[PDB]
Amino acid sequence: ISLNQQRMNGVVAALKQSNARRVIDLGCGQGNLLKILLKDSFFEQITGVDVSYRSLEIAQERLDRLRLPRNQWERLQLIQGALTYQDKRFHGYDAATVIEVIEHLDLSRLGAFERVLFEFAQPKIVIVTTPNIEYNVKFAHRFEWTRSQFQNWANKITERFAYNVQFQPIGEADPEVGSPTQMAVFIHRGH
Numbered sequence: 001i002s003l004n005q006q007r008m009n010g011v012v013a014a015l016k017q018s019n020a021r022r023v024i025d026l027g028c029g030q031g032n033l034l035k036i037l038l039k040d041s042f043f044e045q046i047t048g049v050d051v052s053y054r055s056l057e058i059a060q061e062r063l064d065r066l067r068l069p070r071n072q073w074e075r076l077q078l079i080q081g082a083l084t085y086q087d088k089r090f091h092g093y094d095a096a097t098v099i100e101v102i103e104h105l106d107l108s109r110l111g112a113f114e115r116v117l118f119e120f121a122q123p124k125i126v127i128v129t130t131p132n133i134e135y136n137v138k139f140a141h142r143f144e145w146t147r148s149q150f151q152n153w154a155n156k157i158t159e160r161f162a163y164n165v166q167f168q169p170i171g172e173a174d175p176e177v178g179s180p181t182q183m184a185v186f187i188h189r190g191h
């Protein structure tokens, strides 16, 4: 029950409760979450997106360490691309996951990513997790966000975009500085 494993379980759990079968992982990195989704037949489509070629090659590498039925491999798709660009391949998914990605975006990229995600793609579900820098300080990697910053960011999202947000920490209550990992589950409003 490591921290990362806690994050993944938390994300998979949120996807399932929303019955999000078709998922796109933005900033997929080495494919940690992609490996878990591909192995799980609950998911009907797994797509991972990253701007790094090195990371995508590695993702494909470990994803290949899996043994799966033939029809199961056709669910996977790897795409190189920046998250700040409106890619038509980002449409039609039940959910988009942005895991430990926001902290590594500067101002001239965060705003663009927000539109790409909450306006352009506009999936029904969006799961975002980021490190709680208030936990990393009390229990020692410092450009992370505070619980306040993260929650204001997310609330500001529901003010500009057609979404409502629910917070669900995945780590373990301090219970003074909250859990080590903050998660936000955005659900699109009905029309």
Ligand SMILES: Nc1ncnc2c1ncn2[C@@H]1O[C@H](CSCC[C@H](N)C(=O)O)[C@@H](O)[C@H]1O
Binding pocket: 026, 027, 028, 029, 030, 031, 032, 033, 049, 050, 051, 052, 055, 081, 082, 083, 084, 099, 100, 101, 104, 109
């Ligand atoms: N503008 C951008 N467009 C696409 N990917 C980006 C990006 N900026 C950063 N990334 C990617 O976002 C990832 C941040 S670390 C990702 C870890 C991964 N989510 C996990 O399974 O833990 C890296 O792969 C980085 O290359």
